[PDB]
Each structure stands twice: as C-alpha cells, then as structure tokens.
Subunit: 241 residues, 4 copies
C-alpha cells in the first residue's frame, strides 16, 4: 500500500508504463504519468482519474523536466517514487548507425535517468525516504546485435544506479533497475517472427506488461527497503546472471 | 494470495526461516517448517498453529527427506512452494579448514538443494506449476576470507538453480535465489558496538537487514506476480555488493 | 608478436595509455598514439620513434576523428588494433553535478567508443580480423559515490562492446574491455601515506596496480592468443572487486 | 618465461590439460601433469620429456595428494603454479539424476579444488608468490539444462576462488578461473553435422574453441604479467555468453 506516496512514472501512455501507473494508483499512490504530447498526457489524466494526472514531459529537455516537477509540487507535492520508464529504440548494425540514432538513444534512455534522478533527489534526501526505479532491459546485460546504442544506455543506467545508490542509501533511499526480457507489446502483436522470439525464452512465452509492473511495485514498496543498487531480471529465463 | 498452496520451508526455527514460514502462512498458504530436532519441530508447529506444522528434517539425510515428504503428502498434499533455507557455517582460513568443515558445508548448504528440489520436482512438473526458492548469500557472489566453503556452496546453488530453471521453465515452474547481505540474528545482536561498526561500514544502507525483509522478497518470488522471473538471483544486501 | 599490425591508442600521453603504446610497439606493432594537443601529440612521437607516431585527436569531434584516420591510412594503413583509452573524470555527488559534467563524461568516455569503433570497423570486416579493446573501470561494475557519470559511461561501454562483439564475431574480430582497479599515476604518487592508506585498504593485493600491468592485459587480448575471447570484461583490480 | 617455476597440472592426459602442460613447459617451467592411472601418467611423462613428469593422481584421495606432492618436492621442489583441470561430467535432467552422479561431480569438480589448493597453499605464502588457476566452464555462469550438477561445481569453484583470493592476495598469490565455452574434443568431433550445427548456432564466433586457446589464457594468468588479476573469471567462449 502506497497511501500518502506521490509517484512519477515517465512514458506512461501504454504497455509497461501504463501498467506501472495503474498498479501504483490501485495500491493507494497519487500518480503522475507522462507522455510527449498534450493529448497523450490528457489520455493519462483520463484513465488515472481521481488517483493522478497526466503531464507532458520531454526527458531530453531540461526546461521540460523542471516545468513538470514544479507542476507536480504545486498540485501534489514532492515525488517519493520515481519510475524511469521513458525510452526508445533506433536499431541498426554499427556501420549503418547514424550519429543521431546513437545520440537520441543515449539522451533519451540514459541521460534522462541522470536528469530525472537529480531533479527529485533533494526532497527524498530531506524526507530520508525515496525510491528510484529504472526500467532497463535484458539487452543491457547480454547486449544484442544491431542494438549497440540501446545496450549502451541500458547497461549505462545500471552503472549510474549503482553509483547513485551508494550516495543515498544511508538516507533511506533505494535505487534499482528492473530489466524486462521480451514483453508482449503492440509491436510484438506476424507469426514466424514471434516463434523466433519464443525460441530464446525457456518460459516459452512473452512477458506481460503487468508482470513488469508487479516487480516495480514490489521494489517501490516498504517491503524492499533493503534492496538497492540491484538489477531484478524479469525475462522468463531468456538470460541468467 | 497463497490460498490452496502448500509450502515447505527448511530450517524454519527462527530468523529468516521463521519469518518466511510466518509470512507465507499469513498470506493463506499451508506451511510445513522444519528443524533438526523433534522439539524444534514442535515449537514450529506451535507458532504455525492451524496454518501449518513443524517436522523434523535433516537435509543431508535422504531417508529423512523422503520420510518428511511422505508425511506432508499424507497430511496436506504435494509441495507447491519449496524454500531451501536450511544452512550452516564452519568458518576457517583455508590452510586451517578441516575436511569435515568443508564437507559438512557442501552437504548441508549445496547438496541439500539438489536433494530437496529433486524430491518435489515430479509433482510440480505434473501440475505445470511450482516455485523453488533457495536462500543464498552475498558471500556466494563476492567471496569472503574465512568462508571459502560457505562461498563455494552459496555460489554453487546459483549454478544449480540456473540449470534447473532451464529444465522446468516451460512447465510453469520458477527456480530462483534470494541472496541476503548482513541480516540481524542472535549472533549479530550480541556483537559489540565496535564489531557492529565494522559490519555497518560495509553497508551503504547503514543498518543490518531484517529477517522479515528477506521473507518479503521470498514471498514475492513465490507469488503469481513473479511467474516471469526464473534462474534469477535477487540481492537484498543494502548495497553491500552490487551486480 | 604484432609485427605487421597497425595499432591506434587514444590518450597515449602517459600512464596506462603510454604503457599500452610502448608495449605494442616493443612487440612489433606500428603504433599511433593520440593526445588532445600538438605538444601532447609530439611527446608521443618522441617516445615512439621509428615504431610509430603521435597525432592530435579529439574523440568528441567527428571532424578530428576523420582527419586522424585519414592520416593513419595515408602514412601507415588500416587500423588492425583499436585501444580506446581516452577518458576523463568530472567527479561530484549527484546534486552537485553540472549538466556539462555529465554530458562531457558521456561524450568523452562512452560516445567516443561508438565513434572510434565505427570508424575502423569496415576495414576490419573486410580483412576478416581485428581487435577492439576499451579501457573500462572497476567503477563501471561496482559503481561509486561521486562518480555516477563516470560509472554510467564505463558500464555503458561494456553494453556497447557486448553488442558489437555479437555483430562482428563471425568475422574474426573481437571486442573486449579491460577494467582496471586503482592504478598508480602521478596523482596517487603525490598522495600522503595517510591518503594512500584509504585506497590501499580497498585492495586485497595491498598495492596500487601498475600502468604496465594494464598494458600487459591489453597486449594479451590484442594478440592472436585471444581469438576466442570476445564480449568479455577482464578485471585487473587486485581483488578490489570480484565478479 | 616461466624458467625456475614448478607447475602442477591435474588431468593433463589430453585436450585442454595437455595443451596447458605443453605450453607451460615450452615456456620454461618444470611441469608435472597428472592422470588417473599409471599408464596415463607415463604417457604424460613421454610427451613432457626432460621438461617434466607424469604422475598418477586421484583428486579425491587425500593420501594420493600428500604422496604426489611428496614426490614433487623430492624431485623438483614446491609447486609455484597450480592448474586445477581435472574434471568430469555426469549429465541428466534433475528428475533422473542419480545421487552418485551428483556426488561424483561435486567431489571431482569442486571439492578437488579445495583439496589441491589447500595442499599447495603454505609453500606459496611462505615464498610470497604463487598462482592457482582453475578451469571452470561457461555452464557455471549460464547454467545448462541437463547439467545441474556440472553447473553447481563450476559455479561453486568461482565462489571458492574468490574467497581464497581474498585470503592470499596480500601475499603475492593470485587465484583465478578460466571458463571455456565449447572446446573441440574427440567427443565433439564424433557428433553429427546436425549436432555440431546445434552447438555452432550458440557461438557468435561461428566455431568451436581450441584446447590451445584455453592454454594460452591459462599461461597468461600464470605469468608475472597478471599479478594484479585475482578473484577473476576470464571467459573464453567465442561470445557464447557475455557478462
Ligand atoms: N517492450 C519490451 O519488450 C521491452 C523490453 C525491455 C525493456 N523495455 C523498456 O521498457 C520501457 C517501455 O518502452 P516500450 O517500448 O515497451 O513502450 P512504448 O509504448 O514504446 O513507450 C515508450 C514511452 O516513452 C515515452 N517517450 C519516448 N520518448 C520520450 C522522450 N524524449 N521524453 C519523454 N518520454 C518519452 C513515450 O511517450 P509517448 O506516449 O508520448 O509516445 C511512451 O510513453 C522502455 O524504457 C524500454 O526500453 C521494453
Ligand atoms: N544471518 C545472516 O546474516 C545470513 C546472510 C545470508 C544468508 N543466510 C542464509 O540464511 C539461512 C538461514 O540461516 P541463519 O544462519 O540465518 O539461521 P540459523 O538460526 O542458523 O538457522 C539455520 C536453520 O537450518 C537448520 N539446519 C541446520 N543444519 C540442518 C541440517 N543438517 N538439516 C536440516 N536443517 C538444518 C537449523 O535447524 P535447528 O533449528 O534444528 O538448529 C535452523 O532452523 C542459511 O541458509 C544462511 O546461509 C543468513
Ligand atoms: N588511473 C586509474 O586508476 C584508472 C582506473 C580505472 C580506469 N582508468 C581509465 O584508464 C584510462 C586512462 O586515464 P587516466 O586517468 O589513468 O590517465 P590520464 O593521464 O588522465 O590520461 C587521459 C588521456 O585521455 C586523453 N583525453 C582526454 N580527453 C580527451 C578527448 N576529449 N579526446 C581525446 N583524448 C582525450 C588525454 O589527453 P592529453 O594527454 O592531451 O590530456 C590523456 O592522454 C581512462 O579511460 C580511465 O577512465 C584509470
Ligand atoms: N571440453 C570442453 O568443451 C570443456 C568446456 C569447459 C570446461 N571444461 C573443463 O576442462 C577440463 C578438462 O576436461 P575435458 O572434459 O575437456 O577433458 P577430459 O579429456 O575429459 O580430461 C579429464 C581429465 O581429468 C582427469 N580426471 C578425471 N577424474 C579424475 C579424478 N578423480 N582424479 C584425478 N584426475 C581425474 C582425467 O584423467 P584420465 O586421463 O586418467 O582419464 C583426465 O586427464 C574439465 O575440468 C572440464 O570441466 C571442458
Ligand atoms: Ca486526476
Ligand atoms: Ca539477436
Ligand atoms: Ca571479510
Ligand atoms: Ca539480480
Ligand atoms: Ca614521423
Ligand atoms: Ca567510494
Ligand atoms: Ca571476466
Ligand atoms: Ca542447452
């Protein structure tokens, strides 16, 4: 139960992000989910109803981050739980990877974690309590051909999380990563390609967005106060470390 | 909710083991906790009350294992959740470590995982559902002077868990490890402020972990909310080590 | 023996970078070491002599990268061995870390690996052989207070390397990382015995590593004796961290 | 150059073990390789010639250990380099794995590392220099269906190695693990093309590894060029697994 907690979930329009937002809300938290457009934000406001609000946010833009946080502080208060879910992909074999494909991935998937974390850190340190959870990926640990950029950012946020974790652990704040394997999403939703995927998963199936949300909710709860600088893999056995 | 689930927790007399047993019971599961003596088993039956029973079990003795399981089947049924918590320590620098000190740790902390997992596996495969969770240790991952035997067993059960996880993942069965860092126990409680300081210095969180904290992690992995997690090691060490 | 091989070592002015350049040269390789200034580039030409050359290179500037590669091709040929050693630190606790301190570390310590690798890849693919070795850090694996930016970069370059390794493994090209622990440098040498004691206490080996020790590891991975090693991280930290 | 060093390589009859023995000998070390029978021991003496000797050893019999090290001290001296290569496999899905199969793997592949390391320990600490290298396996890190026992032993030896490394690092002794992926052996050579295809599909490198490649990695770690590497696992698997 998160009664009295304020949670910020970036990229909460659908799939994993939305499941996370709905789950925290269903458990008593006041949730602020974000999208890159005003309409996408409004749609989040629509489903969260009285348990939260949707706001437009660009994790690559310093002014946007500052604007959203002020709005959150004026209507709800300080963020207790930060879930960095915003992310994108720009696949290509190295030789075909554009400088922009690399930079956009680093900025959106890695630098965003730095920016959002620093932005909520202060209040958590004062309150001597907080949760920062970033959605990584199995790719960050095993790497993947054609996704060197995505893997760099996903592996990068782990090193960041470990360092930040060491800086704020004594003040009741945990910093962790939930690394999903293949998750059933609109994209994976025609049938010779799904089986090429299932073949890599011992569980024999794709994970559900709600399954990632359950793991996030666990780490965000008071039941995981002694877990920090840790990566929780949720991949059906696709990879094991 | 564990309603209808039967859980076997080895070494449930106190600390982590007891917290795990009480937590699963409090959430609807019929729990069978074990101890190495009949008296210890009775004390477990006492705190579990109508939600479970305590049984005497020696994880290094096949006859004991089969006998215990035969009893659980008779009174409750097949085990749905297995928590391998039984474990000991026989610390010593390698140059001093006696063969018995090495062997006893291997049999009790590693071979026991093999014996108990194999003993409840068949039924799980048939139901196409199950949970096997072993309590490891940060030591199995970072190593520790004076605990080469303990570290070998704790690291070894991870390799075992990963291998088993791959064999049964398609059958709706998950096999994981929860690796505690420094947890408060009777041993640590009686340490001196000076020694506790030596321990705390290694922990970014600045405190020892609670048995209940490990139990919460175990309960999460044992639930249906962790069906997509297998062959994984969940570290609960306050930042003492990070991988 | 690297006779017949052309190696590019970024940031070879001193310490680890210079040891790497001198070691590859001593073993028969034609070495091109780089620095950020003409003077630095000259110091490198000074110690490499007839076995190589120093060039000015800014790993964050595409123009510079193209210019440098063009020069190596003109005078020496295609790069067979790439050692990404260039890097910097901009330490600070998160709340005190300026955007530019984050941006600079990411561009210099991570994006640089992407840029340089991509610039030597084609020729390697064709020759069906090559070596890409990046100097990471124990910090990339264990993390470190005050170095979240540096940690993010060193951990990210591992994720990059694993991915690249998968793309080129079938073509006789290996992509690895050598992660040093505390290495002796002019800075550490200037520390008082008390200051060093804080560092030494974190290392089981009881001493700082030698720049030459990192160079030896790099030379091993760059040789033909490590053809079956790729996407791997070789830790050289005296036991400071163990994975 | 290992001139003046005495190396003990267990299970040096063929494959990885023999390559290791021949490589260390070729580089100046006096090598003692072992086999489980007198004939196998003689065959090893035959190929080592004036650079070493073959001895019959059972890494599960304490008396054999004392005896073998006894002969070694008498003829050559104290062991400076220990390579734990002896090991076996007893595959089977858990549901059908025999106690003997589990116990045999644990004793031969894990407890053996403890016994031999402990036996050569004192001499090394006294001389403030030594090398202990154990041949692990990728299966120890990734685990493998049908090899829960092999995986437990292989993962367990890393936990063991990390702990011992911590106890002896300050004394100039390093303890490491070289973890091979699929290495070409007579067993793999007899597989059908369909089977080999199954294996190759798991290796980005697109080929099986060679015994000599593992030997080169072992020789590197055993040399003075790897004195700052300890408690580390060097993966040599062609990209089969990446950590
Ligand atoms: N799907 C999988 O199998 C899988 C596996 C492992 C990890 N993940 C990770 O899980 C997370 C969810 O991504 P997804 O691909 O599953 O879902 P998705 O539907 O692609 O959602 C991405 C979300 O991020 C937001 N976003 C994109 N660029 C942004 C920017 N510059 N600033 C702020 N927000 C931005 C999007 O906003 P709009 O709604 O406005 O477009 C959207 O809400 C990602 O971090 C991803 O890397 C997914
Ligand atoms: N305390 C920590 O900080 C910490 C940290 C990491 C991991 N752990 C792990 O957590 C688990 C709990 O151990 P602990 O030391 O915390 O508690 P403990 O109080 O030592 O309890 C050990 C339990 O195991 C049982 N046991 C011992 N030998 C057995 C055998 N041969 N057969 C069956 N049961 C046996 C004991 O039975 P009796 O009650 O009959 O004696 C007791 O219930 C262990 O696996 C341990 O390695 C503990
Ligand atoms: N020292 C340690 O204990 C330790 C431990 C782990 C990892 N490392 C890593 O080892 C490597 C060596 O660094 P160091 O700190 O030991 O030595 P350093 O003396 O700081 O050398 C850094 C080198 O990188 C070059 N460089 C800096 N910014 C550059 C840029 N934008 N473009 C191109 N080159 C640039 C420098 O050029 P100039 O000579 O022109 O200044 C210099 O040659 C780094 O990647 C570092 O992260 C060091
Ligand atoms: N082949 C691979 O792909 C691969 C991959 C990863 C790791 N490995 C590891 O590499 C090592 C080499 O094994 P292998 O299978 O490749 O070669 P192998 O030809 O099976 O050789 C095994 C060696 O160990 C000795 N041995 C067996 N039981 C022993 C005992 N009780 N006491 C003393 N010595 C004993 C054997 O003696 P005899 O000659 O007298 O029979 C033989 O010399 C093993 O530790 C193995 O786990 C192999
Ligand atoms: Ca609302
Ligand atoms: Ca792929
Ligand atoms: Ca210790
Ligand atoms: Ca984990
Ligand atoms: Ca010149
Ligand atoms: Ca520190
Ligand atoms: Ca390694
Ligand atoms: Ca397999």
């Amino acid at each position: 139960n998160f009664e009295g907690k304020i949670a910020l979930v970036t990229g909460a329009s659908r799939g994993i992000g939305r499941a996370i937002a709905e789950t925290l809300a269903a458990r008593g938290a006041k949730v602020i989910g974000t999208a890159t457009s005003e309409n996408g934000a409004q749609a989040i406001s629509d489903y969260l109803g009285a348990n939260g609000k949707g706001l437009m946010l660009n994790v690559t833009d310093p002014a946007s981050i500052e604007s959203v946080l002020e709005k959150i502080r004026a209507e709800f208060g300080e963020v207790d739980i930060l879930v960095n879910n915003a992310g994108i992909t720009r696949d290509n074999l190295l030789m075909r990877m554009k400088d922009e494909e690399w930079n956009d991935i680093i900025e959106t998937n890695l630098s965003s974690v730095f920016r959002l974390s620093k932005a909520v850190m202060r209040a958590m340190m004062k309150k001597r309590h907080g949760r920062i959870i970033t959605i990584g990926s199995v790719v960050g640990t095993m790497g993947n051909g054609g996704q060197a950029n995505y893997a760099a950012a996903k592996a990068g946020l782990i090193g960041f999380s470990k360092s930040l974790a060491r800086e704020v652990a004594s003040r009741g704040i945990t910093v962790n990563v939930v690394a999903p394997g293949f998750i059933e999403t609109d994209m994976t939703r025609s049938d010779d390609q799904r089986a090429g995927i299932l073949a890599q998963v011992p569980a024999g199936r794709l994970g559900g967005a709600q399954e990632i949300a359950n793991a996030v909710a666990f780490l965000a709860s008071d039941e995981a106060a002694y877990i920090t600088g840790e990566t929780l893999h949720v991949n059906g056995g696709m990879y094991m470390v």
